[PDB]
Design a binder for this molecule. Sequence first.
Ligand SMILES: CSC[C@H](NC(=O)Cc1ccccc1)C(=O)N[C@@H](Cc1ccccc1)[C@H](O)C(=O)N1CSC(C)(C)[C@H]1C(=O)N[C@H]1c2ccccc2C[C@H]1O
Ligand SMILES: CSC[C@H](NC(=O)Cc1ccccc1)C(=O)N[C@@H](Cc1ccccc1)[C@H](O)C(=O)N1CSC(C)(C)[C@H]1C(=O)N[C@H]1c2ccccc2C[C@H]1O
Ligand SMILES: CSC[C@H](NC(=O)Cc1ccccc1)C(=O)N[C@@H](Cc1ccccc1)[C@H](O)C(=O)N1CSC(C)(C)[C@H]1C(=O)N[C@H]1c2ccccc2C[C@H]1O
Ligand code: NA
Lengths: 327, 323, 327, 327
Amino acid sequence: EFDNVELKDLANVLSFGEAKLGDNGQKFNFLFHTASSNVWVPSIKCTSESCESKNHYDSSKSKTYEKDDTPVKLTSKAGTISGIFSKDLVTIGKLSVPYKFIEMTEIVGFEPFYSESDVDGVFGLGWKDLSIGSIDPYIVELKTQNKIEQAVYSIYLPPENKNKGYLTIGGIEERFFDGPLNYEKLNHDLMWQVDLDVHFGNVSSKKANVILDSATSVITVPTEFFNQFVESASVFKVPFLSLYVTTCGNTKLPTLEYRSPNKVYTLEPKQYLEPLENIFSALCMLNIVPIDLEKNTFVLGDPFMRKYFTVYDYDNHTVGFALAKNL
Amino acid sequence: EFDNVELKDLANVLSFGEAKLGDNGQKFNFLFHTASSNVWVPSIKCTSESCESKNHYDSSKSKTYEKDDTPVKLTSKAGTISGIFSKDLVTIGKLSVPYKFIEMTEIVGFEPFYSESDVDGVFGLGWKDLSIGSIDPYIVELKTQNKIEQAVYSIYLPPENKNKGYLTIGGIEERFFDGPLNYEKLNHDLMWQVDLDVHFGNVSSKKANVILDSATSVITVPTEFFNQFVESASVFLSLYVTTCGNTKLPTLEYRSPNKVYTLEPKQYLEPLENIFSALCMLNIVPIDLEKNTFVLGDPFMRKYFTVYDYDNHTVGFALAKNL
Amino acid sequence: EFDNVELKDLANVLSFGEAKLGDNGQKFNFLFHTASSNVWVPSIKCTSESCESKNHYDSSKSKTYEKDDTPVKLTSKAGTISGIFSKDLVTIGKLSVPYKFIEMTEIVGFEPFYSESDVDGVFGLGWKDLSIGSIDPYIVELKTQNKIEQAVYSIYLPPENKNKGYLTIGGIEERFFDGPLNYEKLNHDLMWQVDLDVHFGNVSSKKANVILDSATSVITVPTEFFNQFVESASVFKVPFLSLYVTTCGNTKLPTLEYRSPNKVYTLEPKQYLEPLENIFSALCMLNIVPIDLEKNTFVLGDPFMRKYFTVYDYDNHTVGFALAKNL
Amino acid sequence: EFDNVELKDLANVLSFGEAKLGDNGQKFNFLFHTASSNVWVPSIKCTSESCESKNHYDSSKSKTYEKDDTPVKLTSKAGTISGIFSKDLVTIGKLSVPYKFIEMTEIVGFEPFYSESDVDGVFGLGWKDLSIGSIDPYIVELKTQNKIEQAVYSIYLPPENKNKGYLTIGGIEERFFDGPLNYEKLNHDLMWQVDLDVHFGNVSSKKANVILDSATSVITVPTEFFNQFVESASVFKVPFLSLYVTTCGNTKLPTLEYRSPNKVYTLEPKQYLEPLENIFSALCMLNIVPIDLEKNTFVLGDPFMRKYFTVYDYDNHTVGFALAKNL
Ligand SMILES: CSC[C@H](NC(=O)Cc1ccccc1)C(=O)N[C@@H](Cc1ccccc1)[C@H](O)C(=O)N1CSC(C)(C)[C@H]1C(=O)N[C@H]1c2ccccc2C[C@H]1O
Ligand SMILES: CSC[C@H](NC(=O)Cc1ccccc1)C(=O)N[C@@H](Cc1ccccc1)[C@H](O)C(=O)N1CSC(C)(C)[C@H]1C(=O)N[C@H]1c2ccccc2C[C@H]1O
Ligand SMILES: CSC[C@H](NC(=O)Cc1ccccc1)C(=O)N[C@@H](Cc1ccccc1)[C@H](O)C(=O)N1CSC(C)(C)[C@H]1C(=O)N[C@H]1c2ccccc2C[C@H]1O
Ligand code: NA
């Protein structure tokens, strides 16, 4: 034997948390996904190696389980996922309602990321029309059964990792934010998406389609938008050392802004940069990625959510934004 | 109030662990750093807003404190840290020896990233020639003081998470790896750096300087090497984003005279979504550090258990194993 | 005699510092004034009581004094100032040039404030076309005379009073701020004044004339603008205990924004509020005053300069703004 | 670098000075607070960001410290302060006594104002009945322990500035005032509070509760009284350009009167008006704030203490007023 000291991971919070299935309280780790509208879970029957060291849902150990069995198969350019539909108790903290979910039974093609993390499944929190089987979103379902009064939830991510991070259902906790809470109207009942004029230095795109996505740890922007910025950065002498790398202290890096008619949401340069080293880092990389998802569409991930406490209001069809606060 | 639920971090082990100072065991979160040669720690005396949230070293609370007070200051085109040398018991695990560290007294230029991490300081595991003050590396000092027989350590990151990570001092645990341990000679005692021929598709860089650096979570390549790969791609611009589980991409090869070390697309690709991600990005970053220099961080150390041998001036590599 | 403890000031750095007249270094406490265009200094000849406690300029002591004697008289419902123009060495720090200033000869009114305070006079840092006598600005004259090579200055107020403020001449000092430093063009060369769209919750004013004024400790808004705000605050039920008093933590107060084509400058509620009590104050007041100065005109005083480091550039006719930082 | 001149604060003296705790003389800037009844100090053990730049009490450095550890928590609509009671030597000037004080371990809800000021804590000078934990006032304690013979203090603020302010303990220094010293009896031994008839123009409130509060720089008036005054000065054609703003030379403004059975205390426009600009200001605001604290309650802060040297006499349960002189 020799001297071994335990290594740790870094304090880094996202919309990762525990929910429960069945009346025997079967525990899982969920990614609470604002841009998906089903709950998906590793089934006890899953024949896929992926599934081995996960948490499982066993419909025979829960006395409140209901047969549905409607098969479903989803496939990406990247991977494939097939399962069956089940109903049972679904619980987050104190609240519980019977809900229609997908038991995963074959998972091909998401490696080594899927088996590498301690996440079991997705607990979608998007809108009805984006979901398979056309199901009412979980939180609406809580309101239907009068378990809560207002179809609303909120994500607080701790803006400096000094404390726990939280998902709150049924009401707005003022402990989480400073300044005003501001609602924007949804441009569609598909995702949590809003019309905003986006500005990044001299580049701008009016009335862009902008989407909240608690699953990405990136900011996203169209290719052409990203090209215009690269060229404009060049015009404005913003120094870069390669496409994505810059001095963290770079004084020419512009504020990224999303403007509505009555409120501007912003990420300062150091709020969209990732350090190259994990301590005392002189260099930085833009955490902004050109991807073309839809005409004029931009995605807000964790970097936005790290700064903005966000609110999701089914009843009003709005998204609330406020400056996240250290607990 | 209303129904809460706790949200937590995604388990992601790196070379970050605890170490103690003084005979009253002042505890710190350190980045165990293969590319720094001093131990740096926040002083109780630090006047910076950076130092506020952190653990501090307070010499007055330690009977084994030996006064030094030799001033240090590092300044950088943008960055400043400064402090004083002090001598006290430094403890990792069950191992303990008097050692000269730097109590940082001013920390400027590394916000907000510093205060948002729970790292307090750096525990250098590099070589003497880059130590400010020419101080023997901590592990060498353990050996001089007969705390250990061999001035060797190793770093194990769990290759598939689901498992805990380790820094081991003084010998080699077979439990951590599979297949043989291959050793490479250092090209120069400056850092843990080896001569290797690097290849990526049609592009190659002979007799490159490659540095192990436990403090980046990235793989680094010179700008010219990356431009060459872009040019060679021209035969058929992003190329930065691709499909996850795209196997039609080159493998990164680092060739020594008797072993080739590799990182396949699934070692160098990072997903854009944090579950079931359709798209992925290259975790290969072009940046010029020094002539012909490449750096190997985390994504390499996740595949390769690495051994750092001071007695023999070598680095050992082997395939990291579960448990 | 009894036990006495001294009482002091609350740390509150404004654009107030020292400068010198004549080759014998006569010193004065000046308000460095971005919205005025002459230097005004009390004369040794001043006959008023207000002048008794002040520093005085005595031309008979300076071998570099050049006689002008053109009389000036400014007379406004709060007081009247008369004086004569004189020319002499005028010195800020290391820098020095012959300049024309007004020695005040009579100061009627402005009481008790002028004599209660320890400012001697005003050091105008505005544009020529606002100057009495149409005198080139001091900073211009420095460049005209080859003392500096860029006719630019900056004002830094400590954003939390943890260090000294600084007036810098001749170039940009990055220690004061976190990038980006964004430049806006002047709408006119009368004052430091820019076209910006102002938003305060749902109220807005397009293409407003906004003016930097280092001499007020207040934010200014036209009367109508303020009335629109009151209107929508009443409708939306933002809690006010009276016309300016609110809880410091009021979550319904909006952010004040000033939008250029490429950048938004903002004041969060607690950056435009002042506390009722000087410690642990539950209650606050709006430091926003409705005043009709000019069509559609808004003035930025101390609350703004306290958050934004500001650069005043005569060569390029622009003002720069950046997030001020602690030293 | 570049030519730089320092910027300073103005001289504005308030009820704010130094006192020491413990035998090693740990110094703090305290607000000498006539409407608080404990002493509050940040603890070295405080875990809030609020405490970070402040002076701290470290009990283990003082050989005279005695453990108490009684918890205290004060919370409200938007403020939490908690801590523990500790006993040590407490020193103002050459005077020293063992005294129970509160070590703050958490200060939340008072940013950014708390960190922007160089006040560390509050040194209560009120009455026992308002003390948390039922503690004898510091100055009474000085009397009990035979360190002074009269339990009395005074606050002198220099009426025209340049001049230090002074807190005096143990007797009356005639040097601070002109004219008689008039005394008013307390309507209650809770605060330094007095029955007075308050008149402002045509508006009056008889047998008002008027409270001395050395912690506001404002004068306070119930909302109905204020409303009646503004409607009233409308009827009588006062020049107002908005709701608090008038010219600094406004001749027509009434004197504010506080009438007791044998003395009338007054505040003229001179004493209740704050200028919009910090030098040669044409425009002014009423420093009088409408705010309902309790039935018929009016607060006198700085503007009043600036004119009147005030004396606080525990022995005879009275407050004394005299016109303050220049030193
Ligand atoms: C290759 S990322 C290495 C990083 N260097 C940079 O960012 C250099 C840089 C800066 C700007 C433009 C281009 C290049 C760096 O110097 N990091 C340092 C982090 C640090 C840790 C503790 C106290 C202060 C800083 C370094 O790991 C260290 O301990 N040191 C201690 S001394 C130092 C400040 C010169 C640096 C060093 O040896 N740097 C060298 C190094 C290290 C790892 C890999 C390559 C190189 C070359 C040179 O950059
Ligand atoms: C932000 S409020 C500006 C203030 N005027 C007022 O409040 C409006 C007013 C005017 C006349 C009677 C009553 C009310 C004012 O003019 N203050 C002045 C302070 C002063 C400094 C030195 C000697 C005497 C006064 C001014 O900043 C200046 O130097 N001047 C020099 S001469 C002046 C008295 C006409 C004035 C001016 O150019 N004012 C301009 C100004 C300033 C700030 C904001 C808008 C404007 C427009 C313009 O009127
Ligand atoms: C000029 S307003 C006085 C102020 N009250 C307010 O703002 C009223 C308020 C409260 C909550 C929501 C909305 C409005 C206040 O209580 N300030 C306090 C400042 C303080 C100082 C140290 C530690 C914490 C706060 C006070 O002077 C004190 O020490 N205390 C100590 S305990 C207390 C919270 C009961 C309060 C008190 O005695 N208040 C009394 C007071 C003080 C001044 C004027 C009137 C009154 C009545 C009574 O409420
Ligand atoms: Na806009």
